[PDB]
Amino acid sequence: MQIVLTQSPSSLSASLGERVSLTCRASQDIGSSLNWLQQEPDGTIKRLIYATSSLDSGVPKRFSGSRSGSDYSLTISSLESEDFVDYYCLQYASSPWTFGGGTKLEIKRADAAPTVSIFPPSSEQLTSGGASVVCFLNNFYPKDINVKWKIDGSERQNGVLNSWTDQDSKDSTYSMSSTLTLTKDEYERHNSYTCEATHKTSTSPIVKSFNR
Amino acid sequence: MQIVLTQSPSSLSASLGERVSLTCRASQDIGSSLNWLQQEPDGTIKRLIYATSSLDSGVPKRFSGSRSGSDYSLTISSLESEDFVDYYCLQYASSPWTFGGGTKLEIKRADAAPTVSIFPPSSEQLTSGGASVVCFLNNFYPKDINVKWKIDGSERQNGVLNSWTDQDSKDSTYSMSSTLTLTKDEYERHNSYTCEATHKTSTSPIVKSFNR
């Protein structure tokens, strides 16, 4: 049986100067044999902490590692802007070596509803095969959101491409585009087009629509 | 001894059933103490190979690890669709443990020029926080692309967010949005807005504009 490391939380929202802890629970005893890794935006992975508690050379003092039973914690005493990256626990007590799911440090922000814009497809696009209806969802928080597409009241699930931004460095919000990619034929078959957005900040969905 | 692992190549394009090799050169002797990791797009990390040559339990036979002096190689004999992810070498011969820069496998395809679409901001958007001009660059390959913004012929450098999609599973292309955030005042000061793209597949830059 592979040792499973349950990493808490998956996403952690905090502010500059906050004290935060990442927890990593081992499914079987690994003793002191846990390392803490950091993955930078350039994709590079470093080891911060080894053997549960020990700081690697050059690692800032604000990083510290502890163990409470089968729960291993990385603690950052006072968060800095460089620290809002991905973190992984790694156990090397047993083969195979296994990693936690990871923890993304994210900047905590007041909840924001998305500004929703719906654009019908271009005349240039339309005369060639394709018809893409684009739905913009701008500057919402938190990241968790849902977009439905409706054609003449009826939900359409397929032919939909969703693209998210990372957290905005300026205002700490998320944006996303949903594209309902379609044929010229299909588009002119139906009349009414609606993307509806479901977010924490509204008990009922935000709807944007158009016809011909 | 603090050991540098030089990983080749940084990016690797190949097709289904192709044989590929990753190299990882150690700056100092690490003996057989090198592991090969796989990172899934969701950020999950597995160990495929340990102690240079050994396959971890359940790892497919098409993965193989070898060493030629201080050069350590991961070979995938016949690529499958699940295999087009990130790979890292990891040495544990010396403290601190160090990783290679990484290697992203992508699916090779014919070079594609982006289709450029420009969306002016909504009235709702324009009054409320950011007034966003959005420039879509669709179904281009390779992923590397550069997008400038011009306002009435003058280049705008700040208030621009550039966001990539992962490689499309259907057609192996990349898409990309460039968002020029602007003040309500700034926007209605000027009339002409232009995103201009530099890509391999165009000898000259790709231009989209609109006026008021």
Residue numbers in the entry:
A (entry chain B), B (entry chain A): 1 to 212
Quote from the publication:
In this work, the first crystal structure of a light chain dimer originating from mice is described. It represents the light chain dimer of 6A8, a monoclonal antibody specific to the allergen Der f 1. To achieve this, the recombinant production of antibody fragments, Fab and/or scFv, is needed. This work started with the quest to crystallize the murine IgG1 monoclonal antibody (mAb) 6A8 Fab with its specific antigen, Der f 1, originating from house dust mites and associated with asthma and rhinitis. Moreover, when the 6A8 light chain is not partnered to its heavy chain, it forms a dimer that lacks Der f 1 specificity and interacts non-specifically with a wide range of allergenic proteins, such as peanut, dog, and cat major allergens, as well as the non-allergenic protein bovine γ-globulin.
While this structure’s asymmetric unit contained two protein chains, molecular replacement showed that both molecules corresponded to the light chain portion of 6A8. The variable domain expands from residue 1 to 107, and the constant domain is made up of residues 112 to 212. First, the variable and constant domains are composed of the classic antibody β-sandwich folding. Secondly, buried within each, there is an intradomain disulfide bond, formed by C24–C88 and C135–C195, in the case of the variable and constant domains, respectively. Interestingly, despite being a homodimer, the conformations of the chains are not identical, with a root-mean-square deviation (RMSD) of 1.2 Å across all single chain Cα atoms. PDBePISA predicted this dimer to be stabilized by nine polar interactions, which include seven hydrogen bonds and two salt bridges, and several hydrophobic interactions. In fact, the superimposition of this crystal structure with an AlphaFold2 (AF2) model of 6A8 Fab resulted in an overall RMSD of 1.8 Å (across 411 Cα atoms). Therefore, our PDB analysis re-emphasizes the uniqueness of the 6A8 LCD crystal structure, as it originates from mice, is the second kappa isoform LCD structure available, and it is not linked, to our knowledge, to any pathological disorders, unlike Bence Jones and amyloid proteins.
